[PDB]
């Protein structure tokens, strides 16, 4: 089971992003996948943890009500719903599980221009 | 502010849909939106409400863990995520608010052909 992370790019503040977190090798129907991101120099940190079938989906502080994790099980696929998009949400954004690498990652730039 | 549903369709069980509420003549950041469905010559139920800034979203008994609501500001549009979709979520889909009407809705068919 691998994931691949995609649909970072450029942003305003204000804006709105939604990454995608393709599955390979096995389904990810039943199994929480996390959200994490990093910024270079800096720690990275969680964002988002998706449901299960016992559990609801989380949300780290400084996301909560700004950000949404969704599935498409048909395209074995996790998302991450991105609005109200500030500068400090410029990082490179991972998915992962216990049990995948951290991933390439995708980038994220939230900008003045 | 008014709201129009769309993205129904026909799934097999098992199945993924994501459907739309595309809002007009305001903006929803701001604002609880609810999904709602209905099949004909049954009650009229309540499915989801979206997140504001001080509530997170709240699923139905039915579709907890199957469902997810979402939004992307940026297209002023509130989305219904479905998933592992069942032959009883068959019905006709509705969002609004208090402000708005229920709409013309939007047709999804759970069905095995």
Same mark, same amino acid.
């Given at each position: 089971?691998?994931?691949?992370?995609?649909?970072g &790019?450029?942003?305003?503040?204000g804006?709105s992003?939604?990454?995608?977190?393709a +599955?390979?090798? =096995? *389904?990810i129907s039943?199994v /929480?996948? &996390?959200?994490?991101?990093?910024?270079?120099?800096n720690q990275?940190?969680?964002? +988002?943890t998706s =449901? *299960?079938?016992?559990?609801? /989906?989380?949300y780290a502080d400084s996301?909560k009500?700004r950000?949404?994790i969704?599935?498409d099980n048909?395209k074995? *696929?996790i998302?991450?719903?991105?609005?109200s998009?500030?500068?400090?949400?410029?990082?490179?954004?991972?998915?992962k599980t216990?049990?995948?690498?951290?991933?390439?990652?995708t980038?994220?730039?939230?900008?003045?221009?």
């Amino acid at each position: 089971v691998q994931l691949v992370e995609s649909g970072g &790019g450029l942003a305003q503040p204000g804006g709105s992003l939604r990454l995608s977190c393709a +599955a390979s090798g =096995s *389904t990810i129907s039943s199994v /929480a996948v &996390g959200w994490y991101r990093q910024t270079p120099g800096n720690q990275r940190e969680w964002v +988002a943890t998706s =449901s *299960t079938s016992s559990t609801t /989906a989380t949300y780290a502080d400084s996301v909560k009500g700004r950000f949404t994790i969704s599935r498409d099980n048909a395209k074995n *696929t996790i998302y991450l719903q991105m609005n109200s998009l500030k500068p400090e949400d410029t990082a490179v954004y991972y998915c992962k599980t216990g049990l995948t690498n951290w991933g390439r990652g995708t980038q994220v730039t939230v900008s003045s221009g």
